[PDB]
């Protein structure tokens, strides 16, 4: 087997190669909200190399989140140059029916780009 001092991520500047960012499973999570309330989506990004954060919202046109060609309608909400030592947050204040749909968190470094998604459901009051 393999015996090392740490089973965590490879330290920055080590003989081990760096990897693409790792997004923790379950974040963002599918949340449900009532109109007018505030919603916060999380995204825990692990990375040795510097990653850039990006939040998108999937846009629906004619009942479809994809174009006639097949590329997704997405809207850039937030970007960041470095990941946090805590967590990444997307603040959705005073949510309405139009805020519902698919939200995607993205983190990419010198190696790759990783992305996870979640669905926000908005119910009436």
């Amino acid at each position: 087997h393999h015996h090392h001092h740490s089973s965590g991520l490879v330290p920055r500047g080590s003989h081990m190669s760096p990897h693409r960012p790792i997004l923790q499973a379950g974040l963002p999570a599918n949340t449900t909200a009532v109109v007018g309330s505030d919603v916060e989506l999380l995204c825990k990004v692990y990375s040795d190399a510097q990653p850039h954060i990006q939040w998108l919202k999937h846009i629906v046109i004619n009942g479809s989140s994809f174009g006639a060609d097949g590329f997704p309608y997405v809207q850039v909400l937030k970007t960041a140059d470095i990941n946090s030592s805590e967590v990444e947050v997307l603040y959705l204040r005073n949510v309405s029916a139009e805020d519902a749909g698919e939200y995607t968190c993205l983190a990419g470094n010198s190696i790759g780009l990783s992305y996870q998604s979640a669905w926000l459901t908005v119910l009436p009051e």
């Binding site: 097949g70 997405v74 993205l106 990419g108 780009l113």
Partner: protein, 64 residues
């Protein structure tokens, strides 16, 4: 097929990501994005790679 496609798409990302984060000249960044866009749409065949191509272009386009 699909495996060789995603490997080719990763090479385009790393090559583009290295240039955007290196020079701050917005004109040179737009040229690498344009170049990365043309190669990425040619490799993409199914919906998983098309969404992945769209995601990477916007990631590099909005890179600080």
């Amino acid at each position: 097929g699909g495996g060789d496609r995603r490997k080719e798409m990763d090479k385009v990302y790393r090559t583009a990501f290295k240039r955007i984060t290196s020079t701050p000249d917005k004109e040179k960044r737009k040229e690498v994005v344009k170049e990365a866009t043309e190669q990425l749409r040619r490799i993409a065949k199914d919906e998983e790679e098309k969404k992945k191509a769209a995601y990477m272009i916007l990631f590099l386009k909005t890179l600080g």
